[PDB]
Amino acid sequence: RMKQIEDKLEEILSKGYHICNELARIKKLLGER
Amino acid sequence: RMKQIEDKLEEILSKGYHICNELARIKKLLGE
Amino acid sequence: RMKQIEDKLEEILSKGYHICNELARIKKLLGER
Amino acid sequence: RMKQIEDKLEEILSKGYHICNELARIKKLLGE
């Protein structure tokens, strides 16, 4: 269970990196307009 | 205590998945 | 400390609701284009 | 154990604040 907590924390962090990378690409393509 | 925390984490994760779906729809509207 | 954990979990959840509300407005204004 | 978890939470939170800044810039580019 403490392992499944540690697993979920890393899943949340990763996805937050993923999300903020997707928004960074979106910001990029709109600034080049 | 660990169970209350895990439970909330699962819920936070779910919001992230929802955000990624929004971003998928949003990318497509923008052509990307 | 367990209180400050419970406080942070609610801050993360809220902000995730906030974020997904901001993206929902953005999706709305672009679909009406 | 609580300290490792709190520590990661602070870090997750920070990403959220970064995402909100991206969304602020992105809204403005879109006129909104």
From Swiss-Prot, chains A, C:
Protein family according to the UniProt entry: Belongs to the bZIP family. GCN4 subfamily.
Organism, scientific name: Saccharomyces cerevisiae (strain ATCC 204508 / S288c)
Locations listed in the record: Nucleus
Self-association state and partner proteins as the record states: Homodimer. Each subunit binds overlapping and non-identical half-sites that flank the central CG base-pair in the pseudo-palindromic motif 5'-ATGA[CG]TCAT-3'. Interacts with the mediator tail; the interaction with GAL11/MED15 is direct. Interacts with the SAGA histone acetyltransferase complex. Interacts with the SWI/SNF chromatin remodeling complex.
Domain notes: Residues 89 to 100 and 106 to 125 define the N-terminal activation domain (NTAD) and the central acidic activation domain (CAAD) respectively, which can function independently to promote high-level transcription of the target genes.
Span list, region Leucine-zipper: 5-26
PTM comment, free text: Phosphorylated by the cyclin-CDK PCL5-PHO85.
Stated induction or repression of this protein's expression: Translation is induced by amino acid or purine starvation, or during growth in low or poor carbon sources. Translational repression during nutrient-rich conditions is dependent on four uORFs (upstream open reading frames) present in the 5'-UTR of the mRNA; these promote ribosome dissociation. Translational induction occurs in conditions reducing translation machinery efficiency, leading to ribosomes scanning over the uORFs, and increased translation of the mRNA. The rapid translational induction is followed by transcriptional induction at later time-points, independently of the uORF sequences.
Superkingdom per UniProt: Eukaryota
Record note on disruption phenotype: Abolishes recruitment of the mediator complex to the upstream activating sequence (UAS) of amino-acid starvation responsive genes. Decreases RNA level of genes involved in amino acid biosynthesis and cofactor biosynthesis during amino acid starvation or methyl methanesulfonate stress. Growth dependent on amino acid supplementation. Sensitive to amino acid starvation. Sensitive to purine starvation. Decreases cellular glycogen levels during glucose starvation.
Protein role: Master transcriptional regulator that mediates the response to amino acid starvation. Binds variations of the DNA sequence 5'-ATGA[CG]TCAT-3' in canonical nucleosome-depleted 5'-positioned promoters, and also within coding sequences and 3' non-coding regions. During nutrient starvation (low or poor amino acid, carbon or purine sources), it activates genes required for amino acid biosynthesis and transport, autophagy, cofactor biosynthesis and transport, mitochondrial transport, and additional downstream transcription factors.
Protein name, UniProt field: General control transcription factor GCN4
